Amino acid sequence: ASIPSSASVQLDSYNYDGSTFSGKIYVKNIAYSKKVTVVYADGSDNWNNNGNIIAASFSGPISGSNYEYWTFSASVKGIKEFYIKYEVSGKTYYDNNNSANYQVST
Ligand SMILES: OC[C@H]1O[C@H](OC[C@H]2O[C@H](OC[C@H]3O[C@H](O)[C@H](O)[C@@H](O)[C@@H]3O)[C@H](O)[C@@H](O)[C@@H]2O)[C@H](O)[C@@H](O)[C@@H]1O
Incomplete structure (x- = not known):
């Protein structure tokens, strides 16, 4: 969960409190307009x-890097696993935990 050296997108942290699922994502600043x-x-x-x-939104810069932070927070009825989808400059990128997906316990 460091600023990546080359990955296009990288989940950093996440939380699920029983209802609200939230987290923070490193996003390579490939182009201005993004959908995460x-x-x-x-x-x-x-x-x-x-x-x-769930739609993520821009959170803030990571100066000196080619990355920036995006965050998300939304209510869900339940969740077992997930991935990040990132569309920018005409291409789709994923962080799906190298195809395992990210897991939510219980
Ligand atoms: O609907 C309004 C929208 O406005 C903000 O989002 C801005 C911007 O966020 C993404 O882009 C990142 C970009 O934002 C700044 O301008 C920085 O200066 C840039 O360095 C940085 O790369 C997105 O891709 C844009 O389309 C979007 O306009 C709010 O943050 C949003 O929550 C809000 O939806």
Whole structure:
């Protein structure tokens, strides 16, 4: 969970308190306009054809790097796992934990 050397996007930290799912993401500043979303499987591990979606927003700079921070926070009915989807300059990038996805306990 460091400022990456080359990864296009990298989840840093996340929390789920029973209702609110939130976190912070390193995002390479490839171009100005960006869409950063969190796509998740619900409490029964249902990915629902990528239809469970939270929009992240720009949080702040990481000066001296080529990265910036984005954050998210939203209510969910339940969550077992998720990945980050990042669209910028006409291409899609993922942090899906090298295909394992990121897990939420319980
Ligand atoms: O709907 C309004 C929108 O406005 C802010 O978002 C700004 C901006 O955030 C992303 O871009 C990052 C970009 O923002 C600043 O201008 C910095 O100067 C840049 O260095 C930095 O790269 C996004 O890609 C843009 O489309 C967006 O306009 C709020 O932060 C948003 O929450 C809010 O939705």
